[PDB]
Structure 1
Amino acid sequence: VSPSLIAKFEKTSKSNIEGTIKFTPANNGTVSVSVDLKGLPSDIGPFPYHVHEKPVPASKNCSATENHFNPYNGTVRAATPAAHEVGDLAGKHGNIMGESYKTEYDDSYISLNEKSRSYIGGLSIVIHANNGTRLNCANITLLDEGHGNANTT
């Protein structure tokens, strides 16, 4: 059982977007994704969001996360979920939209297993305006403090 992860979005002078995206292991080799966001600038949405390949640095420069996490050469536009990049959550499941957005879904492509080529731990998530401008971003970190088979959290 691989550990749960979370991306925590914080409000700054650059963006009012705040909230969380949680990743928890679920049944049948899937990962449950829970999105809970507010402060979105609705009129410039809907908002693509993706797992990107590099961490958000201390400067909070969303550009420094570089490209989408795409370990299998995926295409931006697809006729089936599997043709999307692994990190292309919005392409597969829908863009964030509105001023507030709360949703839950399963993704069977991302992995919580550090030994998987689809592992998303240590990466980042970027939320974009509809035109591609990066609005806010967050590192993907551990959801729980305490781990191991003899521990509690």
Structure 2
Amino acid sequence: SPSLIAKFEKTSKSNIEGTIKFTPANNGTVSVSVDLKGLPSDIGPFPYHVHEKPVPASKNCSATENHFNPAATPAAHEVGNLAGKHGNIMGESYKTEYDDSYISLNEKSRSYIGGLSIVIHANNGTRLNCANITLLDEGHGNANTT
């Protein structure tokens, strides 16, 4: 299944910028790479989750609606609750890599995260920035390059 990326951009609403990248891993897991800067540290730590609807053109993070949620152990967390399972983002800059065995890159899979969104929150729940989850590579198919 194809890899995905969420690209966060700085605006008057937020200085958070960088990427979260999702690549398929061998043992039924997805490799997640987070590379973010510009975080407002003193209002963190920062939960982040996959939400159920796209970020619209207005960049209103509230319009992504709720968590993609289709605890004392990782599987008991919401699927989209990346932060609950793997750690809140924290600091002014944050770079980390981990495997998640609950999200899916398979179009035909129920836990597919393509076409959804990620929201980064302040610790109090306020939504700070958000990005759509889109294809990481432009060229696909078994006779193509990229």
TM-score by length of 1: 0.95
Question: Which runs of 5 or more residues in structure 1 are unaligned?
Answer: 72-77
Q: Percent of aligned positions with the same letter in both sequences?
A: 99
Query: Structure 1 CA distance, aligned partners of 2:127 and 2:69?
Result: 18
Residue deviations 1:61-116 (CA, integer Å, cap 9, x gap): 00000000011xxxxxx000000010000000000000000000000000000111
Q: Which runs of 4+ in 1 moved over 4 A?
A: none
Q: Secondary structure at the match of 2:84?
A: helix
What's the offset of the Cα at 1:138? Answer: 0.0
Q: Secondary structure at the match of 1:150?
A: coil
Query: Structure 1 CA distance, aligned partners of 2:69 and 2:114?
Result: 14
Residue deviations 1:39-76 (CA, integer Å, cap 9, x gap): 000000000000000000000000000000011xxxxx
Residue deviations 1:4-55 (CA, integer Å, cap 9, x gap): 0000000000000000000000011000000000000000000000000000
Question: Which runs of 5 or more residues in structure 2 are unaligned?
Answer: none
Query: Structure 1 CA distance, aligned partners of 2:66 and 2:17?
Result: 22
What's the offset of the Cα at 1:132? Answer: 0.2
> Number of aligned pairs?
146
| Aligned match of 1:51 | 50
Query: Structure 1 CA distance, aligned partners of 2:58 and 2:11?
Result: 12
Residue deviations 1:124-151 (CA, integer Å, cap 9, x gap): 0000000000000000000000000000
TM-score by length of 2: 1.00
RMSD: 0.3
Query: Structure 2 CA distance, aligned partners of 1:82 and 1:27?
Result: 19
Query: Structure 2 CA distance, aligned partners of 1:91 and 1:116?
Result: 22
Query: Structure 2 CA distance, aligned partners of 1:106 and 1:27?
Result: 10
Q: Secondary structure at the match of 1:70?
A: coil
Q: Secondary structure at the match of 1:87?
A: coil
